[PDB]
Design a protein around this ligand. Sequence first.
Ligand SMILES: CCCCCCCCCCCCCCCC(=O)OC[C@H](O)CO
Ligand SMILES: [Zn+2]
Lengths: 100, 277
Amino acid sequence: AIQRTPKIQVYSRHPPENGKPNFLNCYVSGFHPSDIEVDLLKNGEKMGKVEHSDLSFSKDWSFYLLYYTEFTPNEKDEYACRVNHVTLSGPRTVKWDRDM
Amino acid sequence: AGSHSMRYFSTTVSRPGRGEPRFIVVGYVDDTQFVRFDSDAASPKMEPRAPWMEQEGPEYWEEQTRRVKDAAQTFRVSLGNLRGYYNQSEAGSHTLQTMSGCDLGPDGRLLRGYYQQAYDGRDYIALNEDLRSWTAADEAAQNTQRKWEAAGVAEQWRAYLEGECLESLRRYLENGKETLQRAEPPKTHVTHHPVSDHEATLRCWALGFYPAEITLTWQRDGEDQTQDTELVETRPGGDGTFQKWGAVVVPSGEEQRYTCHVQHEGLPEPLTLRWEP
Ligand SMILES: CCCCCCCCCCCCCCCC(=O)OC[C@H](O)CO
Ligand SMILES: [Zn+2]
């Protein structure tokens, strides 16, 4: 079997404006096999209300998933996405960088 | 554009000794998902995943559910056959993925029909463009190919791809026309972030566009810089649009030598952007 490590992007639906509601996205792509664990982290704690897209895949057969939750950013709060997959040592945490 | 597509993507994952394989199907028109089936769901049924699919009646859904349950049973038999072909252990989990669908040309004709499979993430067998022949990756797939030639499988797919596939795609394109027959151009801008007092990151952004296809490239004095560009994978906004960016790290005094070029169906002209200080 082939194994492909997930790519991870953490971003907002709209440009982040503090105090304005928005959506926090964690897009996980390029991975194989399909079993994966993804969490969104508000200040290093799991967030509830996290939904995810239906499993699909790209032209090269690698899988992708969108995990997302409505949120309202501000100066304090730190956000991140944490992914575990069999291609990884263990859970990988990617911080949300506002300009990426 | 002139060409539009429908695709069904199915994933079947064995979980030996742990119940039947998991089976998930999703359908897309162009880059817009419109249906799903999850065999692990409460009541496994094909169900809508676009608001413009909510006007189909229950008999459509029953037929779709029947077809995917039939396919699921075939894919489970396939997974067992393949494990035997490859002399693989009965304890390991394996994946069968299938793609099928049609490209509908601007005049109503079938541009291309598809039916292909991958096993554990590698190409296995594919219906050729002629819809009357197969391409097999190895001897296992040549075995599958013979069983499929014996059962007239190509003819059955050709019938669907040239008929119901296009008819359904046309209906969806009309039912969801405001969503599907739009070309939403990217909103674009360049940002600039120093990395030292002598170098800066220029990042070219494209946001809010549909469909997903886009070209975004940095040039230095008209010369492509892909080897020095960080280009992220096109990603969904979550709202039916897409986002992408590419970035280069450049000497401060060369910043105006760099241009970002954006091509998208929703754009009248290809864009050329420069860091706007
Ligand atoms: C890539 C998945 C597609 C493969 C199946 C998984 C679920 C598909 C759901 C129905 C759409 C395509 C099925 C169309 C059914 C159909 O007309 O059969 C075809 C040929 O005629 C051969 O029988
Ligand atoms: Zn009925």
